[PDB]
Design a protein around this nucleic acid. Sequence first.
RNA 1: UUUUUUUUUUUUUUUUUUUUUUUUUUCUCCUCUUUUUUUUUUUU
Length: 71
Amino acid sequence: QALLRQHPPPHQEFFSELRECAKAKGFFIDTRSNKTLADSLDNANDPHDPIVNRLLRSMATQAMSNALYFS
RNA sequence: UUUUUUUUUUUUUUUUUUUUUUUUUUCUCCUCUUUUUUUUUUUU
């Protein structure tokens, strides 16, 4: 008896086009764990432009799952 | 030196009654365009 808040893991398909565009300018990423997701993200820092990080994490933020309550 | 007479303002009053807002039409009718539908997160 309580009420908790979950984020069940995502699946590859919202990542597919993401990976595509990562596979368009340089960056190699992989999808096996939120640890290595976040790591292989935060390193990629395109030198001659600022928008890249914002934009990439924002399409990443169009990918993922939901947060809903349960007893 | 000029007398006498020719009516006037309809009579009547001591009758019972058990309803009720309104009121009566007008037909079927092509909604145009990046999408699956996004979604955690924190500061109110």
